[PDB]
Amino acid sequence: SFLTEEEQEAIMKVLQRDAALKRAEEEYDYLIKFLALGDSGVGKTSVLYQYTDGKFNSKFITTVGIDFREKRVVYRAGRGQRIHLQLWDTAGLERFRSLTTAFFRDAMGFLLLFDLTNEQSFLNVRNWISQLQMHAYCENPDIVLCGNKSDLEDQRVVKEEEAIALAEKYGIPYFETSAANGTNISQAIEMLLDLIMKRMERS
Amino acid sequence: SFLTEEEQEAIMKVLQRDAALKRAEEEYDYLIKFLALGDSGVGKTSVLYQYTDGKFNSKFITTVGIDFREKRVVYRASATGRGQRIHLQLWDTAGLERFRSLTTAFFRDAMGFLLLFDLTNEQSFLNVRNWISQLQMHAYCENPDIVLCGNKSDLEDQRVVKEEEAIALAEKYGIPYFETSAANGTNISQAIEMLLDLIMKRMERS
Numbered sequence: 001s002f003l004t005e006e007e008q009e010a011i012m013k014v015l016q017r018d019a020a021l022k023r024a025e026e027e028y029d030y031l032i033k034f035l036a037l038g039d040s041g042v043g044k045t046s047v048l049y050q051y052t053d054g055k056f057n058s059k060f061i062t063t064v065g066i067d068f069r070e071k072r073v074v075y076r077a078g079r080g081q082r083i084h085l086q087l088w089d090t091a092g093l094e095r096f097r098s099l100t101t102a103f104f105r106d107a108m109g110f111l112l113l114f115d116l117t118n119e120q121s122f123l124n125v126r127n128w129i130s131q132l133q134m135h136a137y138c139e140n141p142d143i144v145l146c147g148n149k150s151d152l153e154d155q156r157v158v159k160e161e162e163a164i165a166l167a168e169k170y171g172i173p174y175f176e177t178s179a180a181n182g183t184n185i186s187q188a189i190e191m192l193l194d195l196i197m198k199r200m201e202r203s
Numbered sequence: 204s205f206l207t208e209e210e211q212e213a214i215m216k217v218l219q220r221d222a223a224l225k226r227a228e229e230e231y232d233y234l235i236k237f238l239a240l241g242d243s244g245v246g247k248t249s250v251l252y253q254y255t256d257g258k259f260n261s262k263f264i265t266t267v268g269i270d271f272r273e274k275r276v277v278y279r280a281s282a283t284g285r286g287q288r289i290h291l292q293l294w295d296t297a298g299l300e301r302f303r304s305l306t307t308a309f310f311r312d313a314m315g316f317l318l319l320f321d322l323t324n325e326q327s328f329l330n331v332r333n334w335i336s337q338l339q340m341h342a343y344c345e346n347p348d349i350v351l352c353g354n355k356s357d358l359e360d361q362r363v364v365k366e367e368e369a370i371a372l373a374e375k376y377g378i379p380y381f382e383t384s385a386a387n388g389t390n391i392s393q394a395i396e397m398l399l400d401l402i403m404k405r406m407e408r409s
């Protein structure tokens with residue numbers, strides 16, 4: 001035991017959903033797989049919820065292991081390309097660190113979140129990035145940096161240039177988001193989709 | 204139990220090695236992966252160890268979460284046959300229900316399954332039923348190619364599972380059947396080569 005059966009069958013529910021989804025899309029045109037990561041509480045779930053449903057819940061409900069949201073999107077950079085999105089929402093905790101790290105290998109692009117109001121969020125960005133490229137199934141995976149909780153301008157802590165300096169170092173785009181009001185959330189995600197669908201680089 | 208934090212060092216050096224391997228397919232002719240599942244103690248790890256290194260260990264070391272052996276192999280099609288170079292990744296799941304999420308998360312990465320049970324353990328035989336439906340709910344394919352192995356055939360004295368009841372189950376599911384023994388290596392090579400045969404003959408008509 002020491003792992004609720006109610007805790008485990010939820011994850012197997014998440015696991016069963018993903019199997020069906022894949023068996024369907026190899027039975028819209030493309031299927032693109034995003035994964036969100038960051039310290040627990042930086043708003044990974046609150047972001048994907050805000051992006052896919054335009055809703056936000058103030059009450060903290062930590063993500064048990066792994067979940068994903070879906071969303072149908074039309075892509076444009078000319079022509080309309082239709083897309084099903086799989087947005088993997090990893091638990092940010094240590095207890096689930098192995099289970100989340102496992103699904104790092106199913107994502108085409110990663111949204112890496114820190115909470116603007118919490119130094120550690122930012123600090124641990126360094127590690128999360130090199131764990132991203134440790135555990136990725138293609139050597140330069142695409143990452144978009146998200147300073148989340150930009151709506152708390154009254155409690156922000158990370159300097160913006162400090163974050164774009166960290167962003168410019170690794171060659172990664174940076175967005176200050178708020179899951180509360182949707183600021184830049186669509187723009188940051190679409191930008192990751194941009195990055196991904198340009199990686200289809202013919203030769 | 205919950206995971207030891209040293210049990211999580213282990214599990215993540217494996218994925219380290221796993222991503223490392225996957226990045227070495229673009230950067231073998233075909234990278235073929237299959238996965239071993241079944242109750243704890245059936246011999247999953249021993250069956251792979253016998254196959255990759257012709258060795259065998261008798262003290263039980265239960266697999267911490269997940270591991271995977273590697274083996275390079277020359278696959279020749281079944282009459283005819285030209286040698287293709289297959290790089291095998293042999294996924295080796297733990298059997299304890301307390302890793303079941305983690306091991307189920309890898310049925311994705313698999314192209315085939317070696318479903319195992321213990322010829323000397325009746326309960327692990329009956330659990331197979333459940334293990335198959337788990338492969339039904341979680342394999343990306345479906346009708347995933349499965350090879351059913353009655354491991355531990357070297358212990359004819361301790362045996363409890365009638366051979367008859369086991370072949371029946373097999374053709375009820377239409378899955379090959381093999382009475383293996385990771386101890387003396389009987390059938391260990393022959394069952395795996397059938398999996399690889401079902402698989403490479405399925406990339407066939409992809």
Ligand SMILES: Nc1nc2c(ncn2[C@@H]2O[C@H](COP(=O)(O)OP(=O)(O)NP(=O)(O)O)[C@@H](O)[C@H]2O)c(=O)[nH]1
Nearest residue numbers: 041042043044045046058060062063092178179180
């Ligand atoms: N003000 C504000 N609160 C936010 C924002 N995003 C999330 N929150 C709040 O902060 C908490 C953490 O958000 P949540 O999505 O649960 O974080 P998480 O990264 O998924 N945590 P975990 O990894 O444990 O599931 C919640 O109480 C949520 O309401 C935001 O942009 N602004």
Ligand SMILES: Nc1nc2c(ncn2[C@@H]2O[C@H](COP(=O)(O)OP(=O)(O)NP(=O)(O)O)[C@@H](O)[C@H]2O)c(=O)[nH]1
Nearest residue numbers: 243244245246247248249261263266298355385386
């Ligand atoms: N005689 C005999 N013993 C075997 C055979 N296969 C495994 N065993 C023994 O029975 C035990 C099973 O070990 P193992 O191969 O790790 O089984 P497993 O299915 O991987 N167990 P787990 O899921 O817990 O890691 C060990 O003590 C091993 O020595 C076999 O074919 N013959």
Ligand SMILES: *CCC(=O)Nc1ccc(S(=O)(=O)N2CCC[C@H]2C(=O)OC)cc1
Nearest residue numbers: 105106107108109136137138141311312
């Ligand atoms: C740059 C490529 C990338 O970032 N991600 C990526 C990973 C995996 C896949 S996959 O669905 O084809 N896949 C590989 C092995 C099984 C499966 C998986 O990830 O297990 C869940 C596509 C893109």
Ligand SMILES: *CCC(=O)Nc1ccc(S(=O)(=O)N2CCC[C@H]2C(=O)OC)cc1
Nearest residue numbers: 234236311312313314315342343344347
């Ligand atoms: C039966 C289910 C299945 O085949 N899952 C699966 C997905 C991907 C891979 S893979 O790492 O080998 N891979 C990445 C690029 C090719 C692709 C592949 O194998 O062919 C689709 C393996 C297994």
Ligand SMILES: [Mg+2]
Nearest residue numbers: 044045062063
């Ligand atoms: Mg969450």
Ligand SMILES: [Mg+2]
Nearest residue numbers: 247248265266
């Ligand atoms: Mg084992």
